[PDB]
Amino acid sequence: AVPKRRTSKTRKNKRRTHFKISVPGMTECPNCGEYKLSHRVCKNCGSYNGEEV
Amino acid sequence: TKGILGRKIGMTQVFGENGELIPVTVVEAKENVVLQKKTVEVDGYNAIQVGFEDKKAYKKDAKSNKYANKPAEGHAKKADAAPKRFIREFRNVDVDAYEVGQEVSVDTFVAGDVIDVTGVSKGKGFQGAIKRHGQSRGPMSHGSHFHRAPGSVGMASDASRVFKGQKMPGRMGGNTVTVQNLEVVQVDTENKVILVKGNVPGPKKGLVEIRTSIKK
Amino acid sequence: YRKLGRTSDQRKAMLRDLATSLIISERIETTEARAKEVRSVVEKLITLGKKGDLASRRNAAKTLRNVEILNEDETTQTALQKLFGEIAERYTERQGGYTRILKQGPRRGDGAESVIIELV
Amino acid sequence: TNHKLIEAVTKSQLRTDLPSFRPGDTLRVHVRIIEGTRERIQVFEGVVIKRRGGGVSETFTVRKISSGVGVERTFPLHTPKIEKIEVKRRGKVRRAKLYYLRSLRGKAARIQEI
Amino acid sequence: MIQQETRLKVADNSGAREVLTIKVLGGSGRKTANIGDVIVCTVKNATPGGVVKKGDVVKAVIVRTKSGVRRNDGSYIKFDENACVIIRDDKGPRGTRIFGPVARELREGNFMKIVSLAPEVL
RNA sequence: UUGGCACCUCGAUGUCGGCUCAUCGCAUCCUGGGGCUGUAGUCGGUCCCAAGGGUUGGGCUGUUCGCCCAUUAAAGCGGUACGCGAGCUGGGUUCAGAACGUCGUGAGACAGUUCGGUCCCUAUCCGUCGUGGGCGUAGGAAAUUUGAGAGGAGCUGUCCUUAGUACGAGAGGACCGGGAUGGACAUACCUCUGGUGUACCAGUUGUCGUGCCAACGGCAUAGCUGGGUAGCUAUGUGUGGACGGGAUAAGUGCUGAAAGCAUCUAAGCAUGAAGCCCCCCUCAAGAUGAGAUUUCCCAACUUCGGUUAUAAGAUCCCUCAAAGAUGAUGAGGUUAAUAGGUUCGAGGUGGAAGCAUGGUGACAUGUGGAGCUGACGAAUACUAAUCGAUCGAAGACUUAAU
């Protein structure tokens, strides 16, 4: 129910090994050359699959 | 002893000679080939490696298992066979009889043969102790705050621990299961189908390994 | 099918509203899960439209909401009329794939995947 | 259709001799019965309350009142046990399953002929 | 499916009209019985002047069940009611008349006298 | 067990019974193997070996017990904080109310009774059950594997035959052996029988809408009612504990001396249990002792130390389900049937709308097994799986052999 002992800084940091965010899945856009999320419309130019959206 | 690999098409029924209803599972055992033969001299045990179901040949930018990779294609090519989706060994079968690149046919099995069928059971996902271990529910009334819980997990100060193999909630299904002493009702050479009396483990489209019964 | 985090009645209503909205505007922005459920609903309405029979129009009337679309000519057309009129004519030669979805990326508020679904 | 392989294997089992009957039709069913060594045909006459399934797995249920007690017999449609089926009467019903008939008795259970 | 506390109508002229199942015979932990199974029962309701009396612990064989029985051919038989016959130790019926249809499964059980006395066997 | 003692705990170690879940001992309740018998046979009594598995439902009582009913092969006895209340209950007991008997002058009291009476807690650590990532396993990979270990399973009735034979005055009635079929339990699966089936079909009430009729929509538990596909399921359908082998216990011997005899033991040699080790089933090389087999990839630079991106390969991301909390796993990603749509079916529902006809009308009939249809089978690039990106070898030393 309650923690019997305090968590050391070491123990806490070990648990936070996997607590991280991944780099966004991004590719350079063909039309403009700005990075865009893959399988998503490019916000800068508004083009997907070489067609304006 | 004989072994063939197939997919579970589904279940049906067939009427026997006496008019008895026989529940059966339809298995398709097309495209079985002896990819490799293992011997005590080389591998330390005698078995035949059999590949079932052809897959597409290697392509440069294959992104799926539909197309064979270079390593698999080489192993199949050594047998002079097309790349196979599923490959399994049969130790029961005698090595001498079979030859590498030889097709294994449904006709090997005959009607009335007693067989043992192996397959991976259907997955149920995360399951509680009642479903998973056939445990009893607690009272559903009379002040009960115990319904589908696992019960006591141990004693008290003696042991002061949960023993290993305590039945608890966890993932259920996906286990390899062998049903023994099933029978072949019929073999269809034309459709490449074997009818097996009863039900076999796993989902439809699941690989089934049919072998001669070890117990005789 | 997807429950869409709503009760059965609320889901049905939302899908009817979404379908009607797509018919009126011919493009809408929504969450991915909602769009994937809508594509089936709208396309089945287009199928009824292309048939064009009274039974089809009465069956289509069930799903479609009672809305008025104002034309540039200032003529007033109901959504049901538009589906059985212009939209049916457009996709006469096409078998399926009346709608398409384009992913727009996450929105600020809830980080939900914003997508555009559009007829054609 | 159903799976093509399943249909092919069970196709032989299917019988074409059987007559076409709907639920609510009185049928006379001649069933081959074995009593000891002796084999004889015993006839069960009852309204068809239900028809379900398809292929070799298709079945029908016939309901009779025997000695003041209702009896229902479910037969596999393609069972070789049934010598023949005879449609004595064609009845008017508004549903596929006539489970309501189980509760009803006497005049209430009567079904109007087509 | 007959379990303890199940009440069955008695299809005979023994003098018992209704019985409650004290026990299902067949082994330890045996819970349910179907047609052709002997049960230990008490006479909850009895017709006057019968050989069997109310409050009598007696043995009976089940002749009809709502659950019914599945035959090997894949055919089924079901009844509208659950019924039993009060039987002697020899399996001979205590009563001299059996009422209503009885399953053929009784013949297998060697309850031949009940089968003969029965009006119809289905 | 009832006690003795007062050694831990009074800045709290929850107390009876039941439920859930067990686990262990064996002084064995059943089943297995034996010795003796006042062991004819069938049955028994007693003792020895044996813990593999099994060892029921009810009535009364808070009960534990016990008695009773009906079973069963049998209804074993104990330990585990009289196992188990951060798993459950709260009937008893052990607060405040009230009452009876009783005791007390009284306030009150009673291992006397009676009626009523608040059971908190979001798991930090170990432990346990599942499920991933990192690194290692002297190149990098894709598969197929061996099994050091480990877990699971392990139960029994009845009937027939042998045989009315052995045995017995008769009554009764074997072993050994060979079959058949159940009970309980375990597991797999949905063909069948059923259950469910809130995006399936139909009937129907009230009310409010779509201008009205007709036809529909909303709300009323899914409004209610009758059915029901897939999936998930038991009460449903299959299968299992088979047949054996090795070593043994209590036993039973063979040969045999010490001890001219005798002696199962001392040397030696057999036989002998549901038990042990196997056989059967599942997991398993982090088995750091990291195993094996098959196949794939194999170059340039360079300070000569080594580096490099790339290869084989695998991912990101995307369409998904047979998989799934999420990871993971599997099916696919245009050189494409992965999903949606479309087209055609299966199964389900049970006769759409419209129109016609008959009827005063409610309705009926025809068109027409009609119309509709989530998950199921097939087909079809119409839509979406775009374009891309990232990771990922070049193989240490020593010795022996060649």
Ligand SMILES: [Mg+2]
């Ligand atoms: Mg319970």
Ligand SMILES: [Mg+2]
């Ligand atoms: Mg509750």
Ligand SMILES: [Mg+2]
């Ligand atoms: Mg505790």
Ligand SMILES: [Mg+2]
């Ligand atoms: Mg002292």
Ligand SMILES: [Mg+2]
């Ligand atoms: Mg303290």
Ligand SMILES: [Mg+2]
């Ligand atoms: Mg002992």
Ligand SMILES: [Mg+2]
């Ligand atoms: Mg205790």
Ligand SMILES: [Mg+2]
């Ligand atoms: Mg209390």
Ligand SMILES: [Mg+2]
């Ligand atoms: Mg008081």
Ligand SMILES: [Mg+2]
């Ligand atoms: Mg006291």
Ligand SMILES: [Mg+2]
């Ligand atoms: Mg089905």
Ligand SMILES: [Mg+2]
């Ligand atoms: Mg209304």
Ligand SMILES: [Mg+2]
């Ligand atoms: Mg109206």
Ligand SMILES: [Mg+2]
């Ligand atoms: Mg309101």
Ligand SMILES: [Zn+2]
């Ligand atoms: Zn761009």
